[PDB]
Amino acid sequence: SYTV
Amino acid sequence: SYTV
Amino acid sequence: GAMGSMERASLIQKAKLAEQAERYEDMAAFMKGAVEKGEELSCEERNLLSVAYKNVVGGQRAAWRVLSSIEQKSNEEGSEEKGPEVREYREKVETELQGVCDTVLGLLDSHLIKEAGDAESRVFYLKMKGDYYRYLAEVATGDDKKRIIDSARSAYQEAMDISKKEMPPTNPIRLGLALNFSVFHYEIANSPEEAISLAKTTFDEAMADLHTLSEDSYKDSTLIMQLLRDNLTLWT
Amino acid sequence: GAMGSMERASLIQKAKLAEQAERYEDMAAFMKGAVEKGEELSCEERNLLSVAYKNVVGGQRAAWRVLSSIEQKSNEEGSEEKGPEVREYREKVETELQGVCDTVLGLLDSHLIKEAGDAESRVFYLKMKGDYYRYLAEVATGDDKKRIIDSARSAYQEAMDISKKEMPPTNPIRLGLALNFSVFHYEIANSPEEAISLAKTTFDEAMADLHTLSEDSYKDSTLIMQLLRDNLTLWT
Ligand SMILES: [Ca+2]
Ligand SMILES: [Ca+2]
Ligand SMILES: [Mg+2]
Ligand SMILES: [Mg+2]
Ligand SMILES: [Mg+2]
Ligand SMILES: [Mg+2]
Ligand SMILES: [Mg+2]
Ligand SMILES: [Mg+2]
């Protein structure tokens, strides 16, 4: 998954 | 330059 | 601390040099030294701190996943016994990762969060607290795993509550917080429906607020909205 | 040494795990521990040692070049004075780089080279000695710069002399040694004509020997021959  |  | 004799401004200058040189361990040590001067951090300085530790812990997480996968294959039926070395080395990387998370959480607790009064700083630091408890949760397997998970949840929830009250739905900190909390739901809390609902609602409410923004704020906001959509595409 | 209590075989196993996880600092510490067990290294083990330190020093060299370029721009006419921080941080990275080179050169001197009797090991270690003196030369600016350069030259020359006598012209160690010695001529010794002559002669003599090789040896040899050609294209 994409996180920042 | 290229080295190995 | 080894940075106690260096000027705060010099530490910030060198953190920026270290970023240019992709020396993120150095960058993190410099920013830790700057935090330990005791003064609050500006917006730029907060983002130097987060960039530095995100890169350090990101490398550790990637390495831990490689080693964990090797370890799991070694414990399948038919795999030859190879001794304790895989477990030992995975534990070594895991302990270093936990140490970095504890360092960051220590800086937030002493004393970044308690002095942060503006929404932009308080939400930023609480998101960080949620993030680094999330990374601890990724490797947790013991009797405190539930408490680590709830510590992440609690930090994210407080950050969400403030961000809803004090920031517009397009604020990049609010958006990145919602992004990461949705991933917490999907990957940590076994709550994929909550993850999907949060991502969708966050995206839709940001979309409806884009008309208020300048071109440059529009770019900042839509970049994070795309990550919400990328996750939704993975999850649905 | 911190690895003194770990089995040699365990150190090698963990070096391989660290490579898979791209943890090259760990990989280097494990291989240093293996060397310090005192036994000679097999072909595979020599290449684990070189891979590990090549990646570590490669990152340091890249960072040093970024910082050196910033420092040089800061000393141009019209650039604003920014204080000692750029020089200080470049010096910090430079000193760490020199420490890694000294560590590798220390392992070769105590006692890898003196026990290496076969051509494949002796040429490998002498190439390494030339390489790490070359990296010291890249950052040298003082009264020992000429002696550092001659130390690199001397190691490369001994390796070349043995490789010509004992290895076929397609041997990958011989080819990589000639590649790197030619770069030494071009980048360190201010001898571009010697660099070009060595690269061309090495390539042509390898070409004429390819017919003796199996498919797999052909692949190994032609890969390094392509690097000789890539340098010649840059240089001519
Ligand atoms: Ca001061
Ligand atoms: Ca033993
Ligand atoms: Mg200090
Ligand atoms: Mg553990
Ligand atoms: Mg459903
Ligand atoms: Mg030990
Ligand atoms: Mg120096
Ligand atoms: Mg000429």
Residue numbers in the entry:
A (entry chain P), B (entry chain P): 389 to 392
C (entry chain A), D (entry chain A): -4 to 231
Question: What does the literature reporting this entry say, word for word?
Answer:
The 14-3-3σ protein, which has multiple interacting partners with specific peptidic motifs, was used as a case study. We have observed this phenomenon first-hand with human 14-3-3σ, a protein which has several hundred known interacting partners in the cell. Furthermore, different isoforms of the 14-3-3 protein are function-specific. For example, the 14-3-3σ isoform (but not other isoforms) specifically targets p53 and is associated with tumour suppression, making it invaluable to determine crystal structures of the target peptide with the correct isoform.
To address this problem, we present a combined co-crystallization and peptide-soaking approach to obtain crystals for any 14-3-3σ–peptide complex that may exhibit difficulties when crystallizing under our optimized ‘sigma’ conditions. The second step involves, after these 14-3-3σ–cJun-pS227 crystals are fully grown, displacement of the c-Jun peptide via addition of the desired peptide for the final structure at high concentration to the crystal drop and incubation for a period of time until full occupancy of the peptide is achieved. To demonstrate the experimental reliability of the method, we considered this approach for peptides found in the PDB where co-crystal structures were published with isoforms of 14-3-3 other than the sigma isoform, since they were not able to crystallize under the standard ‘sigma’ conditions or any of the other hundreds of screening conditions tested. Not only does this significantly reduce the production time, but new 14-3-3–peptide structures that were previously not accessible with the 14-3-3σ isoform, despite screening hundreds of other different conditions, were now also able to be resolved. The new strategy that we present here has allowed the determination of several new structures of 14-3-3σ which had not previously been possible, illustrating the ease and success of the method. In addition, the method retains the robust, stable, high-resolution and well diffracting features of crystals originally grown in the sigma screen.
